[PDB]
């Protein structure tokens, strides 16, 4: 269960890594 950021971070939890074309 990975989250530890849906309460005191939310907008501070970079969803996954940087996007990439391919």
Walk me through what this model shows.
It is classed as transport protein. The entry lists the keywords Connexin 32 G12R N-Terminal Mutant, transport protein. The assembly is monomeric. Connexin 32 G12R N-Terminal Mutant,. This protein has about 20 residues and is mostly loops. The N and C termini lie far apart (about 30 Å). About 0% of the residues are buried.
Helical content class: under 10%
* Secondary-structure content class: little secondary structure
Shape: elongated
How large is the count of helical segments? Answer: 0
**Rg value:** 11 Å
The largest pleated sheet is described as: none
What proportion strand? under 5%
Number of strands: 0
First-to-last CA distance: 28 Å
Topology:
Layout lengths: L22
Descriptive tags:
monomer, 22 residues, little secondary structure, elongated, Gap junction beta-1 protein
How would you summarize this macromolecular structure in one to three sentences?
The chain is largely without helices or strands and 22 residues long. Helices cover 0% and strands 0% of the residues.
């Amino acid at each position: 269960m990975n989250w530890t950021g849906l309460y005191t971070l939310l907008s501070r939890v970079n969803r996954h890594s940087t996007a990439i074309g391919r």
